[PDB]
Design an enzyme around this catalytic site. Structure first.
Site, PDB file in Angstrom:
ATOM      1  N   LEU A   1     -22.786 -29.586  -0.076  1.00  0.00           N
ATOM      2  CA  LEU A   1     -24.157 -29.155   0.162  1.00  0.00           C
ATOM      3  C   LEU A   1     -24.591 -28.060  -0.803  1.00  0.00           C
ATOM      4  O   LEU A   1     -25.464 -28.271  -1.652  1.00  0.00           O
ATOM      5  CB  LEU A   1     -24.283 -28.673   1.612  1.00  0.00           C
ATOM      6  CG  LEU A   1     -25.634 -28.308   2.237  1.00  0.00           C
ATOM      7  CD1 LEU A   1     -25.564 -28.513   3.739  1.00  0.00           C
ATOM      8  CD2 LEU A   1     -26.035 -26.872   1.939  1.00  0.00           C
ATOM      9  N   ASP A   2     -23.965 -26.891  -0.708  1.00  0.00           N
ATOM     10  CA  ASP A   2     -24.571 -25.641  -1.140  1.00  0.00           C
ATOM     11  C   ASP A   2     -24.272 -25.274  -2.590  1.00  0.00           C
ATOM     12  O   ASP A   2     -24.370 -24.095  -2.947  1.00  0.00           O
ATOM     13  CB  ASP A   2     -24.141 -24.516  -0.198  1.00  0.00           C
ATOM     14  CG  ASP A   2     -22.644 -24.280  -0.209  1.00  0.00           C
ATOM     15  OD1 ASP A   2     -21.921 -25.013  -0.915  1.00  0.00           O
ATOM     16  OD2 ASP A   2     -22.188 -23.359   0.500  1.00  0.00           O
ATOM     17  N   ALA A   3     -23.932 -26.244  -3.435  1.00  0.00           N
ATOM     18  CA  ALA A   3     -23.591 -25.920  -4.815  1.00  0.00           C
ATOM     19  C   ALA A   3     -24.760 -25.289  -5.562  1.00  0.00           C
ATOM     20  O   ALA A   3     -24.727 -24.098  -5.889  1.00  0.00           O
ATOM     21  CB  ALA A   3     -23.121 -27.179  -5.547  1.00  0.00           C
TER      22      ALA A   3
END
Lengths: 80, 277, 69, 48, 51, 79, 80, 79, 79, 80, 79, 80, 41, 80, 80
Positions: free
Chosen positions: G59-61
């Site tokens: 998700l948070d790349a």
């Protein structure tokens, strides 16, 4: 001068207010779903709440990062 | 104080500590070289760890293990189970590759948990010994792992593995080509503007910025950690010295998940390389 | 196409054989059914259920309480 | 009952529950019990 | 200055060690013990089976 | 002049977005809690206890932004 | 030029906060649905959490990317 | 001049955000409430109790923003 | 002079929008993914595979924007 | 004076425009949920409309306040 | 000077803003496809046929925005 | 003054277009569930449409007022 | 520079770790054999 | 004059980008539900695709008008 | 003058852009549920699509008015 001060103050307001918005509503949806789930199975309240907090901790990292950056910039801005 | 802050900032961002392509090694202002004079620390840590493994690799352990070998067994069992259950039908000895890369990046980001000030503090005695005291304080020390050059190296190393194992099965026909999302669309201006650029950028994006993003996301996390350390270092008298601890353990969890997901992504990329196209 | 559809009371079967199109009023709304339809269970509401046969004609069967699968 | 059957036939699919599992299960209990009662009565008739 | 930072850092480290032992080591030791006990039980099953 | 208005509008947007977020979270929690109470009116004591417990998690930094706005209004640096 | 520096500060604040909102939404959705799903299937929690952290990593790349590059410009600003 | 328009704009933003959040979240809450009623009209009294509870639990910070706007309009510094 | 700052701002915006797009598409996919897998935990790998392919299908033009923004950060046309 | 009067016009536009979205979107949500519920049980339509009119009358009061602030400004307000 | 910087800003807005929109659309698409294949693991082939068809038909106008941005990048109009 | 004319143009665009957006949102919100209900319940679709119209006028009232203010300012923008 | 570095690092190490895994896998087989043996008797 | 060139570039970017985004969001909305429908009941796929095309053409129309206006501002030069 | 030229051109661009956006959202949200229901029952399609066209034309009206104002200024702004 004044322009740069306004720039950084507005930047700090952006960070903290906007992160606060996101975290607040995220808690809203998360708790709503958690309550909806636990209503089905009251038996698993402990473990389910455990995972609830496990992920609540996942949520708030960069909100707090922004809070800290804004607080320091309030105390001392960069590019003096 | 802020003198000390900028004097620290001299150290961190551009790495290659004491690199000089016909320049100075202790200038913090050369800004013109091609040497990476900071990789050696990471490489030496990897080598010493792989020999630490070799101590048990040359050994055969099957009875009751002590804490050391017990933990070794659980670790290797879990990693082998993961590499095995993920993908299959592929015997070119890649499971050790994934194991190695994972545990090395594990340790590499783990080692950065120290206070920032202690590297230059221990190095100050070598500076008194060699290469000056305060002109060392700006930027002369070797830096622990924060340099995105290192991360870039891992990214492109895995990328080389990707290219070579994509042609492991001579997928050169599928390697040069790609599955285009669309050949064209109506409104023939659209057809012309789609035929040439679109599928080409499609094929390019399928692989390019992925390892790049991997490496520079590592760099973001790890740089974020070091800067959080430096900022909390303000006023260490009336502070309770508890600003870090929660965020610190959170970022520790982050590092763990980093290494794990990077090796996961390695697995899926090598699967796609083992998948014909 | 054809689906093997069976209508049965607790006493004994009432309808059996292949059918093409099923129109009922489930525990929720009315639905149309064709072979290859997803696995579902529905509660029959009181009233007649009408289904389309391979001959092009349509059967109808009454239900007063029951379940549909 | 059926402790080793009917769990094999369920593939990576599930019957969708237009009602809640509760009420449909209740109707099933009702009807299944009544059916068994019916069959037992018929068996008593045959024994008679 | 430096010493003020060192003292706080050392406090952090001591809390690290104490809490991490307290909250993490029992599960690891439990896993190790379970592995050893299951291996031993399998062994004993082997000898008793031969008997 | 300019700095005064800039700080003031920073605080204003702060508290406005905070009110927005807290209202949204209030509604989000409320809907599903009502759903659960409709399902379980009996545990409504414990459910409501959990409801307010998690509501305590909700609006910390909104109130922080409100207080920072008050700080800017009353006394703040760079003025 | 100093107002250009204010531009840089604003851009970094944009990235960090606004990607933080990206995370605040993704992780919250995942937490809510994950709690509901594990409530439905309270038995295979291990693999559930396994794939959960899988997704969380996926998700948070990019938001964290924006945060990092923003802070980089905050301190290692190109063309200060 | 500039500060005047800035203050007026800030007050408008405050009240606008308050109204938007109240309306949206409140409407969602009412929708879920009537949904629960359609489930069980008999618990409607207790449900309404919860309604006025959580309504009083949802209107505070909006009214705070209203007060901020009033303070700006009637008598505020930075003018 | 300020157009260098303009280049920086524009690259930042490219990065920021790609960030939300990725972060929220991923949120949706993960939500539905965990929703589905619980039904057929046995069928997990197939769904996982499809999901990975979807994730690849998701992120192309976000890396395009971020790459062009960083190029402009380093190699600066339109100075 | 042109500056601040135009800014006040912008502000009034914000006032009424936000009131507009709040009313429109909230009432759309209410309508969707209401129609769902009433179709579920057409008999209880009286009580449904009862609660709906109650909650709706409770709804647009703050949009009414914003529009009234706009009316105050357009008729006559300070700062003009 | 200002013209080139503003043109760069405009192209950046184009690319990023569209990329975010494409991301959200692909999010919805992939989530629904995942759920569908979850319920019926059998009709996957033609379902993916529809999937690639609908996604290829999805990007056209954001693709136009990309083309305009690149045309600006090489030879911007309104120099 | 013509700068204030641009200001008024911006405010008018704000109000009218933004209210149009809200009207579209509310219409879709009502319409989705209305359509599903009448599809599942055609026999009572008539009084369903009755309520739907009953609330349709309730929807746009505030948007109607906002659009009216915008058009009046288009004709004659006060604070001249 | 790091690319050849790391690929050479792993390549002339790549065999022995897998060579190790055979011991563990056959070991598990012995445990399985114990179970089967208990059953036949 | 450079001001006018920048402003027209901004206007063209607006006209193209927001219309493209309307297309994107609407297309996502249609695609998810069409996929749902074809999944549940594959037999109706022809008429489903017919309705899909019918609504797709209806939706993107005004965004095409915005695209054409962008082109008209690009090749032709009003207000220049 | 130039500044006002850009002001009015941008305002017209916004008027067209928000109209296109809102229209696209409205059609998408309509079409989702329309496809869903029509998939559920292939019988009631006639009056289904009848009400669909009804409400769809009911929706874009204010967007069409914004479009009209934009083209009004396009032929000639009612201002300098």
């Amino acid at each position: 001068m004044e322009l740069t001060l306004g720039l950084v103050a507005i930047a700090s307001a952006i960070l903290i207010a906007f992160g606060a918005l996101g975290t607040a509503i995220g808690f809203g949806l998360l708790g709503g779903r958690f309550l909806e789930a636990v209503a089905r199975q009251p038996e698993l309240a402990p473990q389910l709440q455990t995972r609830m907090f496990l992920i609540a901790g996942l949520l708030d990292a960069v909100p707090m990062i922004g809070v800290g950056i804004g607080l320091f910039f309030i105390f001392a801005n960069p590019f003096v | 104080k802020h003198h000390l802050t900028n004097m620290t900032y001299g150290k961190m961002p551009d790495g290659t500590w004491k690199l000089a392509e016909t320049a100075e090694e202790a200038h913090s202002m050369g800004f013109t070289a091609i040497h990476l004079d900071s990789m050696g620390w990471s490489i030496g840590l990897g080598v010493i760890f792989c020999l630490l493994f070799w101590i048990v690799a040359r050994a055969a352990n099957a009875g009751v293990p002590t804490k050391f070998q017990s933990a070794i067994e659980m670790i290797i069992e879990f990693v082998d189970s993961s590499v095995r259950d993920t993908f299959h039908g592929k015997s070119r000895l890649i499971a050790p590759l994934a194991l190695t890369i994972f545990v090395w990046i594990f340790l590499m980001n783990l080692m950065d948990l120290i206070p920032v000030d202690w590297i230059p503090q221990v190095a100050a005695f070598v500076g008194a010994n060699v290469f000056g005291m305060d002109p060392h304080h700006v930027y002369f020390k070797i830096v622990p792992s924060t340099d995105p050059n290192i991360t870039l190296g891992m990214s492109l190393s895995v990328f080389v593995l990707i290219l070579f194992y994509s042609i492991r099965e001579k997928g050169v026909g599928g390697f040069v080509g790609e599955l285009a999302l669309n050949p064209f669309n109506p409104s023939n201006p659209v057809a012309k503007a789609l035929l040439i650029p679109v599928n080409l950028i499609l094929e390019l994006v399928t692989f390019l910025a992925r390892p790049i993003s991997l490496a520079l996301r590592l760099f973001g996390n790890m740089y974020a950690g070091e800067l959080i350390f430096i900022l909390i270092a303000l006023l260490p008298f009336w502070i309770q010295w508890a600003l870090s601890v929660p965020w610190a353990i959170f970022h520790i969890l982050v590092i763990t998940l980093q290494a794990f997901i990077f090796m996961m992504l390695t697995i899926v990329y090598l699967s796609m390389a083992s998948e014909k196209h | 196409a054809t689906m093997q559809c069976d209508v049965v009371s607790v006493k004994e079967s009432i309808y059996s054989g292949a059918v093409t199109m099923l129109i009922a009023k489930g525990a929720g709304g009315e639905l149309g059914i064709l072979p290859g339809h997803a696995p579902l269970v529905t509660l029959l509401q009181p009233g007649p259920i009408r289904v389309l046969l391979e001959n092009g004609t349509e059967e109808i069967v009454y239900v007063s309480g029951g379940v549909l699968e | 009952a059926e402790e080793g059957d009917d769990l094999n036939r369920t593939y990576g699919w599930d019957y969708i529950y237009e009602p809640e599992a509760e009420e449909l299960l209740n109707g099933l209990l009702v009807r299944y019990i009544e059916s068994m009662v019916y069959q037992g009565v018929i068996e008593n008739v045959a024994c008679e | 200055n430096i010493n003020l930072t060192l003292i706080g850092q050392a406090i952090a480290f001591a809390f690290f060690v104490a809490f991490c032992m307290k909250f993490v080591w029992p599960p690891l030791i439990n896993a190790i013990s379970e592995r050893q006990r299951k291996i031993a039980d399998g062994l004993n099953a082997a000898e008793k089976a031969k008997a």
